Amino acid sequence: PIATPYPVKEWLQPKRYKAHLMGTTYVYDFPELFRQASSSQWKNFSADVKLTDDFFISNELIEDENGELTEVEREPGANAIGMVAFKITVKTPEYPRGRQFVVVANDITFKIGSFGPQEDEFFNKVTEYARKRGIPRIYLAANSGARIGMACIRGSGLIAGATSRAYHDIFTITLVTCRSVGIGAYLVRLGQRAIQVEGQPIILTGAPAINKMLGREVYTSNLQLGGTQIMYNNGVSHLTAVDDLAGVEKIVEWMSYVPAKRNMPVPILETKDTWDRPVDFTPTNDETYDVRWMIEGRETESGFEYGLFDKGSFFETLSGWAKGVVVGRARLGGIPLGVIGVETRTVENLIPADPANPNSAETLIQEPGQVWHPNSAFKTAQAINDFNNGEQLPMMILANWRGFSGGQRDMFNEILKYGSFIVDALVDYKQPIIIYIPPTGELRGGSWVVVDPTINADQMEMYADVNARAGVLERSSRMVAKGVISKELEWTEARRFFFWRLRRRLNEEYLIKRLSHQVGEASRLEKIARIRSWYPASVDHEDDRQVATWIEENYKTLDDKLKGLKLESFA
Amino acid sequence: PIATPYPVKEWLQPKRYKAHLMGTTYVYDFPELFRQASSSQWKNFSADVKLTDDFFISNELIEDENGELTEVEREPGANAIGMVAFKITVKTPEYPRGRQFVVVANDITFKIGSFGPQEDEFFNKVTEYARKRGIPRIYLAANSGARIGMACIRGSGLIAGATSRAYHDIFTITLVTCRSVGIGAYLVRLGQRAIQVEGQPIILTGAPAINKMLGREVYTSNLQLGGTQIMYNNGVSHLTAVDDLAGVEKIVEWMSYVPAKRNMPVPILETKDTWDRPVDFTPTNDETYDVRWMIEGRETESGFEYGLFDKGSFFETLSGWAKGVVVGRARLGGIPLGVIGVETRTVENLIPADPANPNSAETLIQEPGQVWHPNSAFKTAQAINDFNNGEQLPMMILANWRGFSGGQRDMFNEILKYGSFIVDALVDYKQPIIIYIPPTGELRGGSWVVVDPTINADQMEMYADVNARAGVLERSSRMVAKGVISKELEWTEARRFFFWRLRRRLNEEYLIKRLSHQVGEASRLEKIARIRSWYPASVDHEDDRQVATWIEENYKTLDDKLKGLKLESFA
């Protein structure tokens, strides 16, 4: 404007003004949002901890003469390409000493944030930079697809496959801050975890282009093609945000459950809600309830009823799609994990009408609860996979399904394929898994098939509440009387039991892996048997709290016993 | 009956009569069908080769005192469980000395072919038997889901995950000969490759049970739930068969493209259609054609126009689903490979009406050609994966897409997810891949993203016909003038060029793998560079026919050079 308190930033660098007009944050201004978000993270954890600017560091990354990325400190707007990146080192509640990650973003002001060869090469380099260090890769999408002109396509494939590989290697997440087109749209999906800012579409082809090809003004705005109304209900977008700052915050909160880097232990963050306590909220057979209450607890008038997991720790995702199942992250006495629950209340899936079809009309699909449908089966497999890849979290499924929908429509819609994905996802899981049939839950023959522990004995183990029930068609006692399940538990005591059981398993798993590096070639049965032979004779291998406690007291001692097996060198 | 020429088999073993009443072949009679089918296979290859019964051997498999499977020779109907298996050793055109595989099947006569604990344990054992030997596993599904009674569920999970693992390990295929229910239905999908016999449904829950739950006689027969009209159009069934013998034949023909066992070279089977010849049938820009003609050639009045691949070698699959793309196996001068082509003619997808919805009505979806849709994108990824897993075949994609459908409906239907699967599938491919834009073909920016060679440089390489065209929106010369593609070819000479190029790559790939076993740790760039340094100085590394010819002449010599590197032992 004219004569402002401080130096006008849209003048020193007018680029900042273009971004705003585009309805997005200026790329060089994003680092500041992550700082604000991290700051809020601390304020929520401990509303009294003094914080210093040295708790957050952001160093831009650019290629040197050799094309290798190096941290540099320069003035904004100096980027010679439409792709920018930052290496961030921030101290957080889960990692007081600090954790790191990279942020890659298009510069909407640099040639409408188009994807040119140089940008694609830069994006790929940054992704490999992160993978090499096992560091999370955050992508801020604000582009207009691939660049065009007459006076580039080989780069689109490079980053597509690069992102595909990253998902299986490091934690990948994408925030759609302005608009994502073409390769930009695929990148959002390939990194899987996506947060869409209201009003910023994820599109393949623009509305104008489609209206021309069709020869009629059928579409008004791109939001009809890639707006949250489309992608959020789709499952392409795991969450939505009111603005960029809300997006950044969600990114930061999502990471609070993820290891600092590949293969590091899951970040344990204890809060006021200690593990030692009963579970208040309990389901009723003659009363409707929200599964979320069993998970995070419910706020009542006579007070607050604690659920199975830590208060305020439930972070739900993909909440706009296949509402038949509920998926999110949570904490068990501080232990982070992925949770999957079944929605009991019937879902009213309202499918819009195809704008390009005067014959098409709005339809409302009824989705009974406790019944798998293609969409909820797909979401279940997707959740399982996103928990395992990158996040590397343990998992608990509050299994409570009557079965799959065998009707013609759902059968024609390939429910058998999506159900099989569930099996595939479980076979791949590398962290401890817990299947638990809730108090008023059940698991008929149709559903047991895809959640049985024998699918992956190494990581799966199932438990049934004494008030639950399982069978082929239509007793936890008979179940344990077959070996099909580990044990039968009592809801109110579930939190205490699982906290120690999980803690015990995490400790043993850690020991199993380290051993795998030594000998290299040995059966799991043998690896775990050897480890348990290290426990004092007086330790009860079946006591979760005792086993975990001993292991945690002898980490270094066990360490020597491992590297003490260097005699593993055999010809 | 009474006084028949030979001994009544339905009397010596009445079980044979029950099966027939069930509308399926008697389990102990299947081996005979495979013999008949193999016999026909020989008759089609060489209508003059004398054949002896010793060309086909079938030994039943059962568990001994230790529960280990052993070959035995006993009388039929002696099975103590409702699951039977056979180890088959048969001489075939691709393997004159013989190839092996196992056949597992339910006995529809033994307690309606239900899945009990013993059967599940047997099925799992057989699957592991096959995986251990890297031998194909054929499953003949004829069951009534999991067994029930009052006077088993833990076994359903074991075989589900077992089959899931097998798909990635060995060639898996399933023939639905009588009916597949519950776990039986999932097994069909988990093994992926499925051939459905007309009239035999693949169902989760029976019609009677569903009509009861819904409280109305909505369904007449299970065929409305799992009939070919449902699963074949679904993609769950890759093919259909008129009867069990037709099914067995299709199984046998499918295997003729697959290695005898895991990691063995793909079975080369040359026929009268030698590699050295031009390609007759050529596409026109102003004339409609069937992509299949470019693949297998077309029968005309002035004679027969040869296509790109060997005559009669095209074996199409998943032909009832997402007709927008065409996928099948074929041979190039005898070299087996998976082929994917684009259907130009618009597809008329007619979707039936939901019988359980008086409001539902028959709908007809128009699918423009050369345009990806969720279903055809899914089929493309699925084909790629089925070519790689188990089949371990090389692949050629006659890439010819204008792009993806960015419309609201297709966008809401998650096309972005299925498109990404394509990328994932390519990143995973372990055999040589060839992308070739046909003569009148094109590959816009939307489609190039998911088929670019840089997605997987190790196995992918692209070629463009001099009459084709590629660009971001709307010249092979400029393409090679960027390095984005290997070269530009001429349709008529494509067969000759690809035959040698593929043969050359297969030979080099073989050398790369063997080297990988020696040193173990070394870059591909280095492994291939070292191998090419073994070629005589006068050999032109760019001459495919010369390189392949030299390698094939010095297999043993190269063999010594490999194992001559035993000095790889480094500390």
Coordinates of N, CA and C in Angstrom, one line a residue, chain A residues 246-410:
Chain A
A246 N -4.2 -24.5 8.5 CA -4.9 -25.7 9.1 C -4.3 -27.0 8.5
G247 N -3.9 -26.9 7.2 CA -3.3 -28.0 6.5 C -2.0 -28.4 7.1
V248 N -1.1 -27.4 7.2 CA 0.2 -27.6 7.8 C 0.1 -28.2 9.2
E249 N -0.9 -27.7 10.0 CA -1.1 -28.3 11.3 C -1.5 -29.7 11.3
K250 N -2.4 -30.1 10.4 CA -2.8 -31.5 10.3 C -1.6 -32.3 9.9
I251 N -0.7 -31.8 8.9 CA 0.5 -32.5 8.5 C 1.3 -32.8 9.8
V252 N 1.6 -31.8 10.5 CA 2.4 -31.9 11.8 C 1.8 -32.8 12.8
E253 N 0.5 -32.8 12.9 CA -0.1 -33.7 13.9 C 0.0 -35.1 13.4
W254 N -0.2 -35.3 12.1 CA -0.1 -36.7 11.5 C 1.3 -37.3 11.8
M255 N 2.4 -36.5 11.6 CA 3.7 -36.9 11.9 C 4.0 -37.2 13.3
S256 N 3.3 -36.7 14.2 CA 3.5 -36.9 15.7 C 3.4 -38.4 16.1
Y257 N 2.9 -39.2 15.1 CA 2.7 -40.6 15.4 C 3.7 -41.5 14.6
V258 N 4.5 -40.8 13.8 CA 5.4 -41.4 12.9 C 6.9 -41.3 13.4
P259 N 7.7 -42.4 13.2 CA 9.1 -42.4 13.6 C 9.8 -41.2 12.9
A260 N 10.9 -40.7 13.6 CA 11.7 -39.6 13.1 C 12.2 -40.0 11.7
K261 N 12.7 -41.2 11.6 CA 13.2 -41.7 10.3 C 13.0 -43.2 10.2
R262 N 13.0 -43.7 8.9 CA 12.8 -45.1 8.6 C 13.5 -46.0 9.6
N263 N 12.7 -47.0 10.1 CA 13.2 -48.0 11.0 C 13.5 -47.6 12.4
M264 N 13.2 -46.4 12.8 CA 13.4 -46.0 14.2 C 12.1 -46.4 14.9
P265 N 12.2 -46.6 16.2 CA 11.0 -47.0 17.0 C 9.9 -46.0 16.8
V266 N 8.7 -46.5 17.0 CA 7.5 -45.5 16.9 C 7.6 -44.6 18.1
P267 N 7.4 -43.3 17.8 CA 7.5 -42.2 18.8 C 6.5 -42.3 20.0
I268 N 7.0 -42.6 21.2 CA 6.2 -42.8 22.3 C 6.0 -41.4 23.0
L269 N 4.7 -41.0 23.2 CA 4.4 -39.7 23.8 C 3.4 -39.8 24.8
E270 N 3.8 -40.0 26.1 CA 2.8 -40.2 27.2 C 2.2 -38.8 27.5
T271 N 0.9 -38.9 28.0 CA 0.2 -37.6 28.4 C -0.4 -37.8 29.7
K272 N -1.2 -36.9 30.2 CA -1.9 -37.0 31.5 C -2.7 -38.2 31.6
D273 N -3.2 -38.7 30.5 CA -4.0 -39.9 30.5 C -3.2 -41.2 30.6
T274 N -2.7 -41.5 31.8 CA -1.9 -42.7 32.1 C -2.5 -44.0 31.7
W275 N -1.7 -45.0 31.4 CA -2.3 -46.3 31.0 C -3.1 -47.0 32.1
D276 N -2.7 -46.8 33.3 CA -3.4 -47.5 34.5 C -4.7 -46.9 34.8
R277 N -5.8 -47.4 34.2 CA -7.2 -46.9 34.5 C -8.1 -47.8 33.7
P278 N -9.4 -48.0 34.2 CA -10.4 -48.8 33.5 C -10.9 -48.1 32.3
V279 N -11.7 -48.7 31.5 CA -12.3 -48.1 30.3 C -13.7 -47.8 30.8
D280 N -14.1 -46.5 30.7 CA -15.5 -46.2 31.1 C -16.5 -46.5 30.1
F281 N -16.7 -45.8 29.0 CA -17.7 -46.0 28.0 C -17.8 -47.5 27.6
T282 N -18.9 -48.1 27.8 CA -19.2 -49.5 27.4 C -20.4 -49.6 26.5
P283 N -20.3 -50.3 25.3 CA -21.4 -50.5 24.4 C -22.5 -51.4 25.0
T284 N -23.7 -51.1 24.5 CA -24.9 -51.8 24.9 C -25.5 -52.6 23.7
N285 N -26.2 -53.7 23.9 CA -26.8 -54.4 22.8 C -28.1 -53.8 22.3
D286 N -28.8 -53.1 23.3 CA -30.0 -52.5 23.0 C -30.0 -51.0 22.9
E287 N -28.8 -50.5 22.6 CA -28.6 -49.0 22.4 C -27.6 -48.6 21.4
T288 N -27.9 -47.7 20.5 CA -27.1 -47.2 19.5 C -25.9 -46.4 20.1
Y289 N -24.7 -46.6 19.5 CA -23.5 -45.8 19.9 C -22.6 -45.5 18.8
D290 N -21.6 -44.6 19.0 CA -20.7 -44.2 18.0 C -19.4 -44.9 18.4
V291 N -18.8 -45.8 17.5 CA -17.6 -46.5 17.8 C -16.5 -45.6 18.3
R292 N -16.5 -44.4 17.9 CA -15.5 -43.4 18.3 C -15.5 -43.3 19.8
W293 N -16.6 -43.5 20.4 CA -16.6 -43.3 21.9 C -15.8 -44.5 22.5
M294 N -15.9 -45.7 22.0 CA -15.1 -46.8 22.5 C -13.6 -46.5 22.4
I295 N -13.3 -45.7 21.3 CA -11.9 -45.4 21.0 C -11.3 -44.3 21.8
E296 N -11.9 -43.1 21.7 CA -11.4 -41.9 22.3 C -12.2 -41.5 23.6
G297 N -13.3 -42.1 23.8 CA -14.1 -41.8 25.0 C -15.2 -40.8 24.6
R298 N -16.1 -40.6 25.5 CA -17.2 -39.6 25.2 C -17.4 -38.6 26.3
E299 N -17.7 -37.4 25.9 CA -18.0 -36.3 26.9 C -19.5 -36.4 27.3
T300 N -19.7 -36.5 28.6 CA -21.1 -36.6 29.1 C -21.4 -35.5 30.0
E301 N -22.6 -35.5 30.7 CA -23.0 -34.5 31.6 C -22.4 -34.7 33.0
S302 N -22.4 -36.0 33.4 CA -21.9 -36.4 34.7 C -20.4 -36.4 34.6
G303 N -19.8 -35.9 33.6 CA -18.3 -35.9 33.4 C -17.8 -36.4 32.1
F304 N -16.6 -37.0 32.1 CA -16.0 -37.5 30.8 C -15.8 -39.0 31.0
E305 N -16.3 -39.8 30.0 CA -16.0 -41.2 30.1 C -14.8 -41.6 29.2
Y306 N -13.8 -42.1 29.8 CA -12.6 -42.4 29.0 C -12.8 -43.7 28.2
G307 N -12.2 -43.6 27.0 CA -12.4 -44.8 26.1 C -11.2 -45.7 26.2
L308 N -10.9 -46.5 25.2 CA -9.8 -47.5 25.3 C -8.5 -46.8 25.1
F309 N -8.4 -45.7 24.2 CA -7.1 -45.0 24.0 C -7.0 -43.7 24.7
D310 N -5.8 -43.2 24.8 CA -5.5 -41.9 25.4 C -6.4 -40.8 25.0
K311 N -6.9 -40.0 26.0 CA -7.8 -38.9 25.7 C -7.2 -37.9 24.7
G312 N -7.9 -37.5 23.7 CA -7.5 -36.5 22.7 C -6.4 -37.1 21.7
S313 N -6.1 -38.3 21.8 CA -5.1 -38.9 20.9 C -5.6 -39.5 19.6
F314 N -7.0 -39.5 19.4 CA -7.5 -40.1 18.2 C -7.4 -39.1 17.0
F315 N -6.7 -39.5 16.0 CA -6.6 -38.7 14.8 C -7.2 -39.5 13.6
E316 N -8.4 -39.1 13.3 CA -9.1 -39.8 12.2 C -8.7 -39.4 10.8
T317 N -8.7 -40.3 9.9 CA -8.4 -40.0 8.5 C -9.3 -40.7 7.5
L318 N -9.4 -40.2 6.3 CA -10.2 -40.8 5.3 C -11.7 -40.8 5.8
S319 N -12.0 -39.8 6.7 CA -13.3 -39.7 7.3 C -14.4 -39.3 6.4
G320 N -14.1 -38.9 5.1 CA -15.1 -38.5 4.2 C -15.5 -39.6 3.2
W321 N -14.8 -40.7 3.3 CA -15.1 -41.9 2.4 C -15.4 -43.2 3.1
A322 N -16.3 -44.0 2.5 CA -16.6 -45.3 3.1 C -16.7 -45.2 4.6
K323 N -17.7 -44.4 5.0 CA -17.9 -44.2 6.5 C -18.3 -45.5 7.2
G324 N -18.4 -46.6 6.5 CA -18.8 -47.8 7.2 C -17.7 -48.3 8.1
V325 N -16.5 -47.8 7.9 CA -15.4 -48.1 8.9 C -14.7 -46.9 9.3
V326 N -14.1 -46.9 10.5 CA -13.5 -45.7 11.0 C -12.0 -46.0 11.2
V327 N -11.2 -45.2 10.6 CA -9.7 -45.4 10.7 C -9.0 -44.1 11.2
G328 N -8.0 -44.3 12.0 CA -7.3 -43.2 12.5 C -6.0 -43.6 13.3
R329 N -5.3 -42.6 13.8 CA -4.2 -42.9 14.6 C -4.6 -42.6 16.0
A330 N -3.9 -43.2 17.0 CA -4.2 -42.9 18.4 C -3.0 -43.4 19.2
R331 N -3.2 -43.3 20.6 CA -2.1 -43.7 21.5 C -2.7 -44.5 22.6
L332 N -1.9 -45.5 23.0 CA -2.3 -46.4 24.1 C -1.2 -46.2 25.2
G333 N -1.6 -45.4 26.2 CA -0.6 -45.1 27.2 C 0.6 -44.5 26.6
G334 N 0.5 -43.8 25.5 CA 1.6 -43.1 24.9 C 2.1 -43.8 23.7
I335 N 1.8 -45.1 23.5 CA 2.2 -45.9 22.4 C 1.4 -45.6 21.1
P336 N 2.0 -45.0 20.1 CA 1.3 -44.7 18.8 C 0.9 -45.9 18.0
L337 N -0.3 -45.9 17.4 CA -0.7 -47.1 16.6 C -1.9 -46.7 15.7
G338 N -2.1 -47.5 14.7 CA -3.2 -47.3 13.8 C -4.4 -48.0 14.3
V339 N -5.6 -47.4 14.2 CA -6.8 -48.1 14.8 C -7.9 -48.2 13.7
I340 N -8.6 -49.3 13.6 CA -9.7 -49.5 12.7 C -10.8 -50.0 13.5
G341 N -11.9 -49.3 13.4 CA -13.2 -49.7 14.1 C -14.3 -49.8 13.1
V342 N -15.4 -50.4 13.5 CA -16.6 -50.6 12.7 C -17.7 -49.6 13.1
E343 N -18.3 -48.9 12.1 CA -19.4 -48.0 12.4 C -20.6 -48.8 12.4
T344 N -21.4 -48.7 13.5 CA -22.6 -49.4 13.7 C -23.8 -48.7 13.0
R345 N -23.9 -47.4 13.2 CA -25.0 -46.7 12.6 C -25.0 -46.8 11.0
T346 N -26.1 -47.0 10.4 CA -26.2 -47.1 9.0 C -25.7 -45.8 8.4
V347 N -25.0 -45.9 7.2 CA -24.4 -44.8 6.5 C -25.3 -44.4 5.4
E348 N -25.5 -43.1 5.2 CA -26.3 -42.6 4.1 C -25.4 -42.0 3.0
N349 N -24.9 -42.8 2.2 CA -24.0 -42.4 1.1 C -24.8 -41.7 0.0
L350 N -24.7 -40.4 -0.1 CA -25.4 -39.6 -1.1 C -24.5 -39.3 -2.3
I351 N -24.8 -40.0 -3.4 CA -24.0 -39.9 -4.6 C -24.6 -38.8 -5.6
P352 N -23.8 -37.8 -5.9 CA -24.3 -36.7 -6.8 C -24.7 -37.2 -8.2
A353 N -25.3 -36.4 -9.0 CA -25.7 -36.8 -10.3 C -24.6 -36.3 -11.3
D354 N -24.4 -37.1 -12.3 CA -23.4 -36.8 -13.4 C -23.9 -35.6 -14.2
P355 N -23.2 -34.5 -14.0 CA -23.6 -33.2 -14.7 C -23.6 -33.3 -16.2
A356 N -22.8 -34.2 -16.8 CA -22.8 -34.4 -18.2 C -23.8 -35.5 -18.7
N357 N -24.8 -35.7 -17.9 CA -25.8 -36.7 -18.2 C -27.2 -36.2 -17.7
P358 N -28.0 -35.6 -18.6 CA -29.3 -35.1 -18.3 C -30.2 -36.2 -17.7
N359 N -29.8 -37.5 -18.0 CA -30.5 -38.7 -17.6 C -30.0 -39.0 -16.2
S360 N -28.8 -38.7 -15.8 CA -28.3 -39.0 -14.5 C -29.0 -38.2 -13.4
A361 N -29.2 -38.8 -12.2 CA -29.9 -38.2 -11.1 C -29.3 -38.6 -9.8
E362 N -29.4 -37.7 -8.8 CA -28.8 -37.9 -7.5 C -29.3 -39.2 -6.9
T363 N -28.4 -40.0 -6.3 CA -28.8 -41.3 -5.8 C -28.3 -41.5 -4.3
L364 N -29.1 -42.2 -3.5 CA -28.7 -42.3 -2.1 C -28.5 -43.8 -1.8
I365 N -27.2 -44.2 -1.5 CA -26.9 -45.6 -1.2 C -27.0 -45.8 0.3
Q366 N -27.7 -46.8 0.7 CA -27.9 -47.2 2.1 C -26.8 -48.2 2.4
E367 N -25.9 -48.0 3.4 CA -24.9 -48.9 3.8 C -25.1 -49.4 5.2
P368 N -25.7 -50.6 5.4 CA -25.9 -51.1 6.8 C -24.6 -51.2 7.5
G369 N -24.7 -51.1 8.9 CA -23.5 -51.2 9.7 C -23.0 -52.6 9.9
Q370 N -21.8 -52.7 10.3 CA -21.2 -54.0 10.6 C -21.2 -54.9 9.4
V371 N -21.4 -54.3 8.2 CA -21.4 -55.1 6.9 C -20.4 -54.4 6.0
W372 N -19.4 -55.2 5.5 CA -18.4 -54.7 4.5 C -19.0 -54.5 3.1
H373 N -18.6 -53.5 2.5 CA -19.1 -53.2 1.1 C -17.8 -52.9 0.4
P374 N -17.8 -52.9 -1.0 CA -16.6 -52.7 -1.7 C -15.8 -51.5 -1.2
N375 N -16.4 -50.3 -1.0 CA -15.8 -49.1 -0.5 C -15.1 -49.3 0.8
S376 N -15.9 -49.8 1.8 CA -15.3 -49.9 3.1 C -14.3 -51.0 3.2
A377 N -14.4 -52.0 2.3 CA -13.4 -53.1 2.2 C -12.1 -52.5 1.7
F378 N -12.2 -51.6 0.6 CA -11.1 -50.9 0.0 C -10.4 -50.0 1.1
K379 N -11.2 -49.3 1.9 CA -10.7 -48.4 2.9 C -9.9 -49.1 4.0
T380 N -10.5 -50.3 4.3 CA -9.8 -51.1 5.3 C -8.5 -51.6 4.8
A381 N -8.4 -52.0 3.6 CA -7.1 -52.4 3.1 C -6.1 -51.2 3.0
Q382 N -6.7 -50.1 2.5 CA -5.9 -48.9 2.3 C -5.3 -48.4 3.6
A383 N -6.2 -48.4 4.7 CA -5.7 -48.0 6.0 C -4.6 -48.9 6.5
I384 N -4.8 -50.2 6.4 CA -3.8 -51.2 6.8 C -2.5 -50.9 6.1
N385 N -2.5 -50.6 4.8 CA -1.3 -50.4 4.0 C -0.6 -49.0 4.4
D386 N -1.4 -48.0 4.7 CA -0.9 -46.7 5.0 C -0.3 -46.7 6.4
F387 N -0.8 -47.7 7.2 CA -0.2 -47.8 8.6 C 1.1 -48.5 8.6
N388 N 1.3 -49.5 7.6 CA 2.5 -50.2 7.5 C 3.6 -49.5 6.7
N389 N 3.3 -49.0 5.6 CA 4.3 -48.3 4.7 C 4.5 -46.9 5.2
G390 N 5.8 -46.5 5.4 CA 6.1 -45.2 5.9 C 5.8 -44.9 7.4
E391 N 4.6 -45.1 7.8 CA 4.2 -44.9 9.2 C 4.8 -46.0 10.1
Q392 N 4.9 -47.2 9.5 CA 5.5 -48.3 10.3 C 4.9 -48.5 11.7
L393 N 3.6 -48.3 11.8 CA 2.9 -48.4 13.1 C 2.3 -49.8 13.5
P394 N 2.1 -50.0 14.8 CA 1.5 -51.3 15.2 C 0.0 -51.0 14.9
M395 N -0.8 -52.0 15.0 CA -2.2 -51.8 14.7 C -3.2 -52.6 15.5
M396 N -4.4 -52.0 15.7 CA -5.5 -52.8 16.5 C -6.7 -52.6 15.6
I397 N -7.4 -53.8 15.4 CA -8.6 -53.7 14.7 C -9.7 -54.2 15.6
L398 N -10.7 -53.3 15.9 CA -11.8 -53.7 16.8 C -12.8 -54.4 15.8
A399 N -12.4 -55.6 15.4 CA -13.2 -56.4 14.5 C -14.6 -56.6 15.0
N400 N -15.6 -56.2 14.2 CA -17.0 -56.3 14.5 C -17.8 -56.2 13.2
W401 N -17.7 -57.3 12.4 CA -18.4 -57.4 11.1 C -19.3 -58.6 11.1
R402 N -20.5 -58.5 10.4 CA -21.4 -59.6 10.3 C -20.9 -60.4 9.1
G403 N -20.3 -59.7 8.2 CA -19.8 -60.3 6.9 C -19.8 -59.3 5.8
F404 N -19.6 -59.8 4.6 CA -19.5 -59.0 3.4 C -20.9 -59.0 2.8
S405 N -21.2 -58.0 1.9 CA -22.5 -57.9 1.3 C -22.4 -58.8 0.0
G406 N -23.2 -59.9 0.0 CA -23.2 -60.8 -1.1 C -24.2 -60.5 -2.2
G407 N -24.9 -59.3 -2.1 CA -25.9 -58.9 -3.0 C -25.3 -58.7 -4.4
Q408 N -26.2 -58.7 -5.4 CA -25.8 -58.5 -6.8 C -25.0 -57.3 -7.1
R409 N -25.5 -56.2 -6.6 CA -24.8 -54.9 -6.9 C -23.4 -54.9 -6.3
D410 N -23.2 -55.2 -5.0 CA -21.9 -55.2 -4.3 C -21.1 -56.3 -4.9

